[PDB]
């Protein structure tokens, strides 16, 4: 342990659907446009929830 400064979640906190890299703090969603498309939906990249297909 040295210079212990944990990363702060990108989209505030409430975006629990996002996961974050522990060292570089870069965030990616667990949910995807591929998942949503399989459900005949598309991803709302703000919340990373599946919404009506904007197509």
- Terminal CA distance: 49 Å
Q: Would you tell me the structural class of the helices and strands?
A: alpha+beta
**CATH class annotation:** Mainly Beta
Give the radius of gyration: 14 Å
What is the assigned CATH homologous superfamily? Vascular endothelial growth factor, heparin-binding domain
The CATH topology label is Vascular Endothelial Growth Factor-165, Heparin-binding Domain
Q: Percent range for helical residues?
A: 10-25%
What general outline do the C-alpha atoms trace? elongated
Query: Number of helical segments?
Result: 1
The strand line-up of the biggest sheet is 1-2
PDB class: growth factor
Keywords: heparin-binding, angiogenesis, growth factor
Assembly: monomeric
Entry title: heparin-binding domain from vascular endothelial growth factor, NMR, 20 structures
Write up what this structure looks like.
There is one protein chain. The chain is an alpha+beta fold and 55 residues long. It has one domain (1-55): Vascular Endothelial Growth Factor-165, Heparin-binding Domain, CATH 2.10.160.10. It has one helix and four strands; from the N terminus they run E-E-H-E-E. It has one helix at residues 33-38, and strands spanning 18-20, 27-29, 42-44, 49-51. The strands form two sheets. The chain has a two-stranded antiparallel sheet. Strand 1 and strand 2 form a beta hairpin.
